[PDB]
């Protein structure tokens, strides 16, 4: 494929509002998307106060790094809050979700194999 290097301020990427049956109060920035990635994609998620990504599972893994705030992670059994500087590995098919129980925006990097889209 193409040559070169992209270097960009992540916040300059246009966010997309996510509103589905299981997601509310979330915006996503596709940093390294399907148009460019040979193998896996990089997204930056922002969750507003009270926002929620309800428990779900999917047949690809997810790799996360928490960039800002206190993120509540929903698990098959119960929940756990993590903060900036934590990483999360979600195995394929593992139940997971996310909630923001704080008064300010929470952000994380999420990477998936490109077969799961962007």
């Amino acid at each position: 494929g193409p040559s070169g290097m992209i270097l960009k301020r992540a916040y300059d990427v246009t966010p997309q509002k996510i509103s589905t049956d299981k997601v509310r109060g979330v915006r996503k920035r596709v940093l390294i998307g399907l148009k460019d990635a040979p193998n896996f994609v990089m997204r930056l998620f922002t969750v507003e106060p009270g926002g929620l990504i309800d428990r779900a599972s999917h047949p690809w893994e997810e790799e996360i790094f928490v960039l800002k705030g206190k993120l509540t992670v929903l698990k098959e059994q119960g929940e756990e809050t993590v903060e900036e500087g934590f990483y999360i590995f979600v195995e394929p098919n593992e139940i997971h979700g996310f909630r923001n129980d704080t008064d300010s925006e929470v952000e994380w990097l999420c990477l998936i194999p490109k077969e799961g889209g962007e």
Copy 2:
């Protein structure tokens, strides 16, 4: 089926070769866990350097802390916390810390690149 951990608590590996000095690397999500790509966290001391190199796989980076000097095929460019970098396969690249404090970034590569 879910790992949640503070990245700092992963023991860093000092890297010192002919080509790399003043760098520590943490493997956060490595080959034991990852089906497709790995997650590392690099910390570079003031004056640390990863000399120009290239590899057959791509690299995806997110700058977490500080002002990172990126060595390119042509010259160099400085970036800061909050920048992402996409390095195409085979693109020459390296890194330097010209500041007086530690610089950190996340680096992800496909598993063919090892951890």
